[PDB]
Amino acid sequence: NKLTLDKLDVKGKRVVMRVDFNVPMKNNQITNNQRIKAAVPSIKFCLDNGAKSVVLMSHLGRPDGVPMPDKYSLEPVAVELKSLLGKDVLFLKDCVGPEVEKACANPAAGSVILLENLRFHVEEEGKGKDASGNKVKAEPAKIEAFRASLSKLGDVYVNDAFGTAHRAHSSMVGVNLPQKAGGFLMKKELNYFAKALESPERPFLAILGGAKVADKIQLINNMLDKVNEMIIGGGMAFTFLKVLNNMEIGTSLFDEEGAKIVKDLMSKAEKNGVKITLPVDFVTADKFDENAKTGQATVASGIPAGWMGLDCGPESSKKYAEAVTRAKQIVWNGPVGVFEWEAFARGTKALMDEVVKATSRGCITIIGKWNTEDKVSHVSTGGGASLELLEGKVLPGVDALSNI
Ligand SMILES: Cc1nc2cc(-c3ccc(Br)cc3)nn2c(C)c1CCC(=O)O
């Protein structure tokens, strides 16, 4: 029970809101505006309930504590947000200090202000790199001044930046105001994850894909305490199948360090009564390339020398659909093939099709140009944060919110 924005009285108040506007950019303009979109409901709520101002703060990229306004400025985000809000956004070329404080001290009623990239200061992350690429540490008195300056910019604080909530950064745990509320995005992410983690509908299926095994050990370990079924798919599966079945895997991804714990994970699954589904067939490629020659293989055939599996095949898609069919709650993290490449996308799109059907019949479905909004219960906006939650860790940014 943390304070949320809907329970905060903002009438006549300056709202300082941490958002996640760390959007994809191409040299350098906005390629996907979904994170910006995702914040509008909190922003409008504030303006609709009489807030005097909304001061928005975020990072963009990894400028590493160096001001990089030619490369990583938030300026284009002000223009995009104006389009999406239907309201003027003032952009400020810094995020702390006397001119910014004065600008945010008493804005005209209803003013939306977006500050420049917080990570242009080393005090946000607390560590950074210099102009030469060497590591620098922030000084405590400077971190204190930075956090104090941010704290002046609002009367109340909102954190809607679930994508950054795993970082104990100044804008996340250092704002000292009497009320610190989660935004509606934050609320939605924590509710889908708390529900799922602590009181799952059943059966609860975890679908885990991605490339490396060793970086998902704790994820799998924690999820085996919560779930009833688990598909281990995608690039990870080859390490499992090599160890458990002595499968011939070609040049498929193999994690030497993960391989040591495969059997340990399968034991924990056997100990908690979790039914594990691995793939049984593959689309193969002659090299790691979008237009590689393709082939087909099974666990029993092996993958031929020099070839790699980049997708599951049709029999796997069936077994995966059977598990999705049985589930009343699904959490999916990581794809089941190289879905950016059409030839290796069928498995992922097929599994998505199933998850969308499941949603239609009341399955709670969580995925860690498309209106994906209508089709699944929840698409998470934060990769690393949602992983850290799935691994069973506390998020500093959530823990810092006010209780009530
Ligand atoms: C960057 C990268 N990402 C992925 C992802 C996948 C991948 C993902 C799914 C499946 Br099924 C099979 C392979 N392979 N892969 C490789 C070989 C690379 C490059 C080399 C490596 O990091 O091992």
Author numbering: 5 to 372, 382 to 417
From the paper:
We now report characterization of CRT0063465, a novel pyrazolopyrimidine compound that emerged from cell-based screens of telomere signaling. CRT0063465 targets the nucleotide binding site of glycolytic enzyme phosphoglycerate kinase 1 (PGK1). We show here that DJ1 and PGK1 form a previously unknown complex in cells. We show that both proteins bind TRF2 and telomeric DNA.
To investigate binding modes of the unlabeled parent compound CRT0063465 to these proteins, X-ray crystallography was performed. A PGK1- CRT0063465 co-structure was obtained at 1.9 Å resolution. Binding is perpendicular to the nucleotide binding site. The compound bromo-phenyl moiety occupies the same position as the nucleotide adensosine ring. The aryl ring is co-planar with the pyrrolopyrimidine scaffold and the para-substituted bromine engages a deep hydrophobic pocket. The carboxylate moiety on the distal end of the pryrazolopyrimidine scaffold is solvent-exposed and does not interact via any polar or hydrogen bonding interactions with PGK1. CRT0063465 makes no hydrogen-bonding hinge region interactions. This mode would be unusual for an ATP-competitive kinase inhibitor, which normally bind mainly through this mechanism. CRT0063465-bound PGK1 domains are locked in the “open” conformation, each interacting in a clamp-like fashion with a single DJ1 monomer on opposite sides of the complex, giving 2:2:2 CRT0063465:DJ1:PGK1 stoichiometry.
